[PDB]
C-alpha cells in the first residue's frame, strides 16, 4: 500500500471526465497481474516525489465495471493521465521510472 495513492470508483467519473481536480495519473490495475506489481514501487516513488503537483490514483478493474469500459481498457497496467478532468495521454504496459517521468513531464 502506497501512502499517498488514492483509489477511485465509478462515481469519481462522469462519463469520460474525471471528477478529481488537477493533474491526475490513473493506473488501471489488478491485484493478480504480474506487470502491475512490477510498477507498483515506481508508482509509490512518483506519488511521493510529485506530491502537490500530481495526484496518483488507482482503479482496480476487478472492483469497478463502468469506468474501464468507458475508456476501452484492454490491457493492464494502463496508465492514463488527466488534467482538469480531461484525458490527455495513455500508456499501456510496465515501464521504467525514466520513461514514466518523461511521459508525465511532457504532458504536464
Amino acid at each position: 500500500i502506497s501512502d499517498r495513492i488514492i483509489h477511485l470508483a465509478d462515481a469519481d467519473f462522469d462519463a469520460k471526465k474525471l471528477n478529481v481536480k488537477g493533474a491526475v495519473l490513473i493506473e488501471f490495475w489488478a491485484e493478480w497481474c504480474g506487470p502491475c506489481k512490477m510498477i507498483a514501487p515506481i508508482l509509490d516513488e512518483v506519488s511521493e516525489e510529485y506530491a502537490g503537483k500530481l495526484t496518483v490514483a488507482k482503479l482496480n478493474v476487478d472492483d469497478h465495471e463502468q469506468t474501464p469500459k468507458a475508456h476501452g481498457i484492454r490491457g493492464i497496467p494502463t496508465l492514463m493521465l488527466f488534467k482538469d478532468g480531461e484525458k490527455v495521454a495513455t500508456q499501456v504496459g510496465a515501464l521504467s521510472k525514466t520513461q514514466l517521468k518523461a511521459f508525465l513531464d511532457s504532458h504536464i
Partner: protein
Amino acid sequence: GDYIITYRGDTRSFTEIFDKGFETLGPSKDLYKHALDNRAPPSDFVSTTIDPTKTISFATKYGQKSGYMYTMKTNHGIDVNKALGARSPFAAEAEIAMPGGVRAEDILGARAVNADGEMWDYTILNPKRY
C-alpha cells in the same frame, strides 16, 4: 465458496481460450488415477498451479516455443497435495485440479511468453469477463 487465483501455461492462443475456456478430455473423477496417469483413464480435470513460475517450462516446451500464461479465479478446484499427501507424485507443481474444466468466464487474462522465457510487459484482459 472460497475463490483462489491459479495459473496455467498453454500453447493455445487467447482468442480460443477466452471464448471456450479450458475443457477436459475425459470422464474419470478419480483423483488418484489422475495423478498416476491422467490419460489412462482420461480424467475430468484441468491442471492449474498456484505458482506462476511453474507454468513457464510447460508453456515454452522447455525453452523451444512461445506460448501463453493464463490467470484464472475459481472456487471449485481440488488441491492435489492436500488430497494425496506425501505420496503426491509431483508435489512441487503445487497443482490445483479443476473438475469438469474451467469456464471462460473465470479466466481473467493472458500474458505471452517467448521461447527464451521473456514475457509481455502487460496482461490482456478476458473480454468475456471484462
